[PDB]
Every structure is written in structure tokens, then in C-alpha cells.
Design a protein around this ligand. Sequence first.
Ligand SMILES: COC(=O)[C@@H]1C[C@@H](O)CN1C(=O)c1ccco1
Ligand SMILES: COC(=O)[C@@H]1C[C@@H](O)CN1C(=O)c1ccco1
Lengths: 164, 164
Amino acid sequence: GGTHIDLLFHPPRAHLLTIKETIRKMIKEARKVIALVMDIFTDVDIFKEIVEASTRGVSVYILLDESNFNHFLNMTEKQGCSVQRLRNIRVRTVKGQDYFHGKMEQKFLLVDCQKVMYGSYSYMWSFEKAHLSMVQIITGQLVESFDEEFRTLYARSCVPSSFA
Amino acid sequence: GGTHIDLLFHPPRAHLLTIKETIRKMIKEARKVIALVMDIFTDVDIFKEIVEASTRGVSVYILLDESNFNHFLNMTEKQGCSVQRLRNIRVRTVKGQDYFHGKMEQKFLLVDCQKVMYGSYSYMWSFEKAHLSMVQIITGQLVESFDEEFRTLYARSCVPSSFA
Ligand SMILES: COC(=O)[C@@H]1C[C@@H](O)CN1C(=O)c1ccco1
Ligand SMILES: COC(=O)[C@@H]1C[C@@H](O)CN1C(=O)c1ccco1
């Protein structure tokens, strides 16, 4: 087996779902595991879908850029929905080399070791309404390289300071 | 023919060249055309390579995020190297929908309609020294989709205001 890749764009071009609707669909259809690497995560709709998935029993692992993590924490506080009290979600932070903050500038979503969304869309209102972006939907062989990269990032991640 | 994809990382993992050395190599080996879509372009080494390519006769088309274009202009002024006086380089800007600036958040390099570098590396010192990032080197069938996306972006681009 090879690798299959479909492109999606924001705004949409020659496909039926927006990128955001495709993210929510990927998450709603997850059976086993969600592995997410994201620079900035403030989009409440996407967060809700991930929380719902975790309540069905899906194991969710989230790696967030350290410098922007406060924005995720602010969003989860506003929502009354602490990741520390959700048993099936683990969140850790990843940073680069400071000099000015070094950042984890990689974004992808990996579901059931089966499908990846890889591209320039960040989970924020601005990507739904303001920015131009594109992603690949990847299935097949190359997915295993994303699994390996998620594990690689996970190994260099830290428990966030906030958490006890 | 299908599509072939190799991953590269910053910092490097199981490959010989850094992403930046691979960018310079792609550019130095271009025979015909370079098509670049970039959010922020301040890296002087990469810029030098693109100028050299244009002086060999390579047609270079650069699409830059509008909101960050001043940073490119500042870099080319510091370098004494105006894109308006280089006959084989065209530069245009692309913007999103403002509300706060909407941005073109897509980055890729497309050389000779043959090879693409697609991923999270921006052409700035910070990506060489501080940030974690990854790209794909793509060849084969999927390259034609990047060609089509470059043309799509180009059609929605503007002459930058500075230029006369
Ligand atoms: C599917 O929803 C949309 O495409 C909306 C509809 C119109 O408001 C344009 N738009 C944008 O999101 C956008 C982002 C960058 C440039 O435009
Ligand atoms: C090939 O050059 C490098 O990898 C340098 C060497 C060491 O200084 C680490 N590094 C980084 O660029 C970096 C970016 C994010 C985290 O580390």
C-alpha cells in the first residue's frame, strides 16, 4: 500500500466541507486515539468535539506550543472545562530554543493511526474567518511517519507548569 | 506515475541536510522557474540564492503575505538589492479578510514544476535557530496540484503599493 493525499483549502475550492468542518468530522469519527500537535488552540467548537470524543472513550493526546499555551488555558477556563479533570485527555507543551521565544511551529491532527490532516490551519477563529490556508488529508503509508513524529515530539514535551 | 514524499525536520532527524540547506540547494539547482509562497521572508542567505538564480535566467515568482511584506522590503533595502530592478523576479502580495489583518498562511516552494517543499518552515533567522518545524519534499503527481494552487494564489494577488 501507498499513500493517498487530497488537498483542502480555506476558503474552500472544489470540495464540499470547509477545513473546520472536516476537522470536526475527523474528531467525531475517531474510535480509538486522537493525537494533535498545534501551535495555538482557542477554537471552542473544535475543543468541544475533542471533549466529546474523550467522553466516548477515545484517548486524546495534545501537544501545544509552550509560548501560546496560556491561550488554550484561557479558553478552557472560559468554557468551564478543565483538561486536568478529563480523564481521557493528556496535554503537554513543546518549546523551541529561546534567545524571544522558540516555538513549536508544526501543526497536524492524527486520528486512529489512520488519517492525518497536515497543513497551515491553526485552531483559532481567525483561521475560520480571516486567513487563507490549506491542508492535506493523508492516508496510507505516510501516516506512520506522522505517528513517529508525534512520538518524537511527545518525548520532548513538558508537563505544563500550571498542572499539579 | 504516483507521488513520492520525504520528510525533513528542524532540527534534523535522520537526514543529512538541514531544511535551510535543502532550500538553498533546491534554488541553486533550479533550471527554469521558481514559484514561492511565503508568509515572512527575511532570510538573507535564501534571498541571495534566489537573486543568483534570477541572474542565471530562472524566472522567479514570489507571493508574500501582505501584512508582513514590509519585512521583506526592509531586508531587500538593507541588502541593496531591489526586486524592482531585477528583471527575472516578480513579487506580489496576497491578503486574507481583515476584521486585525487576515493573512496568507500558506508556505511552499515549487521549483521547475518538478519538486515542492511544503511545510511549516518560514524564511527567517528564527526558523534556522529557534523554532521546531517540518517540511515535505514532494515529487510526482501531487506537484501539479501545487502548481495549480500557486496559479490560484497568483490570481488573487496585488501589486504591492510601494512598487511603480
Ligand atoms: C466558507 O466560509 C468562507 O469562506 C467565508 C465566506 C466569505 O466571508 C469569505 N470567507 C472566509 O473565510 C475567508 C478567509 C480568508 C478570505 O476569506
Ligand atoms: C542544525 O542546527 C541545529 O539544529 C541547532 C544546533 C543546536 O543549537 C540546536 N539547533 C536548533 O536549531 C534548534 C531549533 C529548535 C530547537 O533547536
